[PDB]
Design a protein around this nucleic acid. Structure first.
Ligand SMILES: [Mg+2]
Ligand SMILES: [Mg+2]
Ligand SMILES: [Mg+2]
Ligand SMILES: [Mg+2]
Ligand SMILES: [Mg+2]
Ligand SMILES: [Mg+2]
Ligand SMILES: [Mg+2]
Ligand SMILES: [Mg+2]
Ligand SMILES: [Mg+2]
Ligand SMILES: [Mg+2]
Ligand SMILES: [Mg+2]
Ligand SMILES: [Mg+2]
Ligand SMILES: [Mg+2]
Ligand SMILES: [Mg+2]
Ligand SMILES: [Mg+2]
Ligand SMILES: [Mg+2]
Ligand SMILES: [Mg+2]
Ligand SMILES: [Mg+2]
Ligand SMILES: [Mg+2]
Ligand SMILES: [Mg+2]
Ligand SMILES: [Mg+2]
Ligand SMILES: [Mg+2]
Ligand SMILES: [Mg+2]
Ligand SMILES: [Mg+2]
Ligand SMILES: [Mg+2]
Ligand SMILES: [Mg+2]
Ligand SMILES: [Mg+2]
Ligand SMILES: [Mg+2]
Ligand SMILES: [Mg+2]
Lengths: 205, 145, 116, 60
RNA sequence: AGGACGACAUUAGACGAAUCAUCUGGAAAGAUGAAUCAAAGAAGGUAAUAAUCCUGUAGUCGAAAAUGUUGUCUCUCUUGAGUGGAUCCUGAGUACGACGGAGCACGUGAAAUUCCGUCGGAAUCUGGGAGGACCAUCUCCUAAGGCUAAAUACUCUCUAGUGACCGAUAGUGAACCAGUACCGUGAGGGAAAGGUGAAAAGCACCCCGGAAGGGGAGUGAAAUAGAACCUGAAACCGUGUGCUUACAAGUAGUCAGAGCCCGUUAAUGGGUGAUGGCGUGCCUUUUGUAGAAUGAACCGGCGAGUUACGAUUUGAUGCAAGGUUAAGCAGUAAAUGUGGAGCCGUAGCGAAAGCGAGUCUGAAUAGGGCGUUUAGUAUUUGGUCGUAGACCCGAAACCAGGUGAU
RNA sequence: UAACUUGGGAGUCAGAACAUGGGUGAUAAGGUCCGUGUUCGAAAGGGAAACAGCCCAGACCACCAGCUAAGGUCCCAAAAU
RNA sequence: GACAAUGGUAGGAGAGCGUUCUAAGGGCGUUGAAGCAUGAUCGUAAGGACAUGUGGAGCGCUUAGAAGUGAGAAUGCCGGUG
């Protein structure tokens, strides 16, 4: 209930502002219907086959009936020919359901409370640099040490932090109102500015 | 929690049986239909409620009634729900909505009485019931019907 | 995601053909008839393992009764006297005594005859 | 497409759990016994609501 | 109602940062070690798997010309507000009506509004209609003349993209000089057929044969990769072989067990079988089948409960007398923020007026039927229904629109 | 050791032979039609020479173990000339 | 250690292996991948392995999703061979 603050290599003054959003015991089965939701929503279902109707040809009736001594076969493009016609193909559809608006926040206050209640969180003070230098950020990730998967969060925008750190494998730079739930449990280390940390309890609680 | 070891809910994912996929499933070669007849054919199924030529249950019974054109549906707030607030100022079709009690009252908000008033409250309703209008004048309070 | 039967079949039928060797002619080379013959061969195997217990205590009854009347005793009067003698032996032993070593069985027939 | 009720349900009123018919054989002959003409009230339908509870679903 | 004065977008293209060394290898992009750019770790190619080898990407620039948006000015154009209303005009064979008929969700019925056909046929501001026939009163609005952008529906194409979409019996019929060979007089039907290698290095020469082919040599990491060419399974036709067969009655096995040959993923070992018991294949269909009932020549490959929208049910998970968003608008075609119009539930009874913890029939406070004492709600995994072709495969047959008297 | 109330999911509405009470038939049928039991259908084994319906008895799998039921005991073929 | 229960069609109810793809984690691959052939091995079933040949480049294993998911019959369709 008191997260310690660092700035760019140096300890400084810290806050306690982690009360209800950071500290709930994580309700795991709420998360499993939220991590499954988004990843079954990213993808554009666009896949079709042409069934027995829309193939070309087939008005002929090849054998007649009685007399010839073959099957009672009907057209040329029935499914059991080597021609087309597929009886049960994939209809182009959409993969999208929704949870109610209370459950839709209770996963997200459970996702980052999985970070803070056990093994891993860090709040840094803000940091600006005008010219986009990738090397001046890979420098920073190894001082205050994080593993390969790491998530930085600006308060509403960043003309450089959104535009640096876009080359390194394992880094995502997300504005604090774009906080989804897959990446925040895909990562292992939240490193956030101190300006947005006061806002996320003022917007999720 | 983490991605690589996520476990589902506790008795919530059951996998659906593919029917007619082997003799050793319990649905073999005929997949639950039977042997022959009307039900076992593809797409067959009788319309619901059809006794087979014998006229259905909704031909013997006779019809009666007509609804209305104006059937004013009072949003029936009971008298018990008022035992939550205080100062006894008013109850109001602008306020009794926005304390969450009533929503989308069609026309008129009648006070049916099946609780306990328990307060010298002042109302302002649309129209009343007979027994509940005694309960408001029991402990003391006027209105505007 | 279309999936076709890529080698869930020919890795399955070549553990029937390989499990069916030495059958005559064209019932060891090809699936659709040799699946039937192995499918009876279990149905026999469940049946006749209830014949080895119905055949070998039909063998021993011959080779005891062949050796019982080499001592003026029929088989039926023998095991009546043998049970009255309080002898809890099988038949498979009473065979295997009476064919390797007569001199044991030479007095065993006496004890049953002497209870009567 | 939404489930389409059929309007033979001008002949039944949802009580709070069960249906409510109106008893048959009303008009067209009254050369009929007198205490049986006295039976003109209504009864709830029997347990053949198995055969019709996908037909009358939106009267609720 | 036409047209000169002046910023962008298309139709070609530029520049574009960062690496070596060893090892196995035919050859490294691989392994191990030492480095470097990064607004560039999209993607493909290069003798294997490359951020730093090539083409590229991020970010920047360019346009003689010719069109499209267009900003500005220049031009055309152009008077607009009030009062008196003592007179004058406001869309004629029209609106309507009778008669048969179509459309309005509405089958001529109690039938307004709407258009066409035939025939009769008004009044004009105290007018004229319309408020589900019609009359009265009250509110609303002025037909029988015209014109009109945006929200919205579509892709044979064009530009740039994406895919829990297929990888040659799949995907379009058509990857392959496809609506082509080919069948029909005709209208119209309508196929099969992809892969040498890194590079053609595509076998110089010697030998048998007329040639085709073939054995050596030779290229190549590999020709057991030879232009029917990667990989090469089954049916099936063959070659010498270890055991076994010419006195025998057979749904072809299985369980005993002799003799001779071989030695294993080393285990109560593998192959062969002189002789005894035991015994009428499989599936569909049946009161019943070895059945002389049906179906299959054999081996491969393809080939049958699916999806959207709803309704009801149990199982799950949020919240609790409360639960809940639709369309839209912002946003990695991010599933998250807002939107409380609505739906369901907290109270039912009766056809209805209406009444209310109780109503209804009823002359009754009598007796009855249905209620009251509280759990509903939103999403989703299952089982089943309904509308769609809705487990697949099969009919003679109907109705449109055409091609044929050789 | 069942029964009943409620709620999801069906399948059957072509039966057959024996043993007995009956109608029809001719005290004819492996006939047809009812009652009532069993077995088969949906049940493999042992006996009835072979033989869905008769006679014993209900198979979770192993073993070269013992008693017994129905039918049998000179030989084919286990057991008494 | 007991104690009982386990024939079975139509049909109802549970637990399961395998195939193709994606997500995340973690690996094996010119000192030889997937398929192909052969073998006396392991699990109660569907099935899982491991050596040895042939093969020349892209695969497994755990967790969790989505389905064009399994072949012996349709006088089935197509290609081969009797
Ligand atoms: Mg079954
Ligand atoms: Mg079958
Ligand atoms: Mg049926
Ligand atoms: Mg059938
Ligand atoms: Mg039938
Ligand atoms: Mg059909
Ligand atoms: Mg197949
Ligand atoms: Mg360049
Ligand atoms: Mg470069
Ligand atoms: Mg008319
Ligand atoms: Mg191929
Ligand atoms: Mg060609
Ligand atoms: Mg060489
Ligand atoms: Mg071969
Ligand atoms: Mg014979
Ligand atoms: Mg049957
Ligand atoms: Mg025959
Ligand atoms: Mg045939
Ligand atoms: Mg002529
Ligand atoms: Mg008889
Ligand atoms: Mg009977
Ligand atoms: Mg029974
Ligand atoms: Mg017999
Ligand atoms: Mg015999
Ligand atoms: Mg069973
Ligand atoms: Mg089931
Ligand atoms: Mg594969
Ligand atoms: Mg076949
Ligand atoms: Mg034929």
């Amino acid at each position: 209930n008191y997260d310690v603050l660092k700035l760019d290599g140096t300890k400084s003054g810290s806050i306690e502002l982690s009360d209800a959003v950071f500290g709930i015991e994580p309700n795991n089965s709420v998360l499993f219907e939220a991590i499954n939701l988004q990843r079954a929503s990213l993808r554009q279902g666009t896949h079709a086959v042409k069934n027995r109707s829309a193939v070309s040809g087939g008005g002929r009736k090849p054998w007649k009936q009685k007399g010839t001594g073959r099957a009672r076969q009907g057209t040329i493009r029935a499914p059991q020919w080597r021609g087309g016609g597929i009886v049960f193909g994939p209809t182009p559809r959409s993969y999208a359901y929704k949870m109610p608006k209370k459950m839709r926040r209770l996963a997200l206050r459970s996702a980052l409370s999985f970070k803070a209640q056990e093994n891993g969180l860090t709040v840094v003070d803000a940091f600006n640099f005008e010219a986009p230098k990738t090397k001046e950020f890979k420098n920073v990730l190894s001082t205050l040490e994080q593993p390969k998967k790491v998530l930085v969060v600006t308060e509403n925008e960043d003309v450089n932090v959104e535009l640096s750190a876009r080359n390194i494998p394992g880094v995502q730079v997300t504005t604090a109102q774009g906080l989804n739930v897959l990446d925040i449990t895909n990562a292992d280390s939240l490193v956030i500015t101190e300006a947005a940390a006061k806002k996320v309890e003022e917007v999720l609680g | 929690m983490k991605l690589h070891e996520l476990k589902p809910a506790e008795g919530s994912r059951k996998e659906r049986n593919r029917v007619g996929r082997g003799v050793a499933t319990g649905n073999g070669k005929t997949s639950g239909r039977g042997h022959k007849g009307q039900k076992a054919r593809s797409g067959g199924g009788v319309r619901p409620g059809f006794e087979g030529g014998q006229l259905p249950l909704f031909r013997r019974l006779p019809k009666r009634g007509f609804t209305n054109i104006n059937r004013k549906e009072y949003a029936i707030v009971n008298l018990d729900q008022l035992n939550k607030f205080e100062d006894g100022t008013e109850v109001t079709p602008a306020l009794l909505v926005e304390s969450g009690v009533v929503k989308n009252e069609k026309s008129g908000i009648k006070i049916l009485g099946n609780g306990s008033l328990d307060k010298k409250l002042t109302v302002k309703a649309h129209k009343f019931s007979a027994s509940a209008a005694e309960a408001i004048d029991a402990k003391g309070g006027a209105h505007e019907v | 995601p279309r999936v076709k039967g890529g080698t869930v079949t020919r890795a399955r039928r070549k553990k029937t053909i390989k499990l069916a060797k030495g059958y005559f002619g064209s019932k060891h080379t090809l699936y659709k008839v040799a699946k039937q013959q192995v499918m009876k061969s279990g149905q026999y195997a469940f049946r006749d393992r209830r014949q080895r217990k119905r055949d070998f205590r039909k063998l021993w009854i011959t080779r005891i009764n062949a050796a019982a009347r080499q001592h003026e005793m029929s088989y039926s009067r023998l095991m009546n006297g043998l049970k009255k003698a309080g002898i809890d032996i099988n038949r498979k032993m009473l065979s295997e005594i009476a064919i390797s070593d007569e001199k044991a069985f030479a007095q065993l027939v006496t004890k049953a005859k002497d209870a009567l | 497409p939404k489930m389409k009720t059929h309007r033979g349900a001008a002949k039944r009123v949802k009580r709070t759990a069960s249906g409510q018919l109106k008893r048959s054989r009303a008009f067209t002959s009254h050369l009929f016994a007198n205490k049986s003409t006295k039976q003109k009230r209504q009864l709830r339908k029997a347990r053949l609501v198995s055969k019709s509870d996908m037909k009358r679903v939106k009267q609720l």
